[PDB]
Amino acid sequence: MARNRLTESEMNEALRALDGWQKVDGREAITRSFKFKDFSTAFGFMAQAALYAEKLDHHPEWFNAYNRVDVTLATHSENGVTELDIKMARKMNAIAG
User: Fold this and answer.
1) Which of 1, 7, 32, 75 could form a disulfide with 20 if both were Cys (CB 3.0 to 4.6 A apart)?
2) Which of 61, 72, 57 has its CA nearest to residue 1?
3) Domains in the chain, ordered, with CATH?
4) Phi and psi of 63, rounded to 5°?
């Protein structure tokens, strides 16, 4: 796995395959706001995502309020967006359906 951070063009290209994800305005990070039918479903999503965070040792910045989960991803050690963020966004998209 390439660990390096992405250029803005590479990030833009990578986002194409990640439905609902966008670059954070003014920030080297990507984000999606998930909307579930209720808290239980949102919590299930967070539980599954948490497993993967520990699998990768790569943890999201995320906010939950009942059925909404807002996620922001960046890689601290590389001070930018890397393949780890892409992997997490991909997995989250798979979990959420």
Assistant:
1) 32
2) 57
3) 1-97 (3.30.1360.20)
4) -125, 135
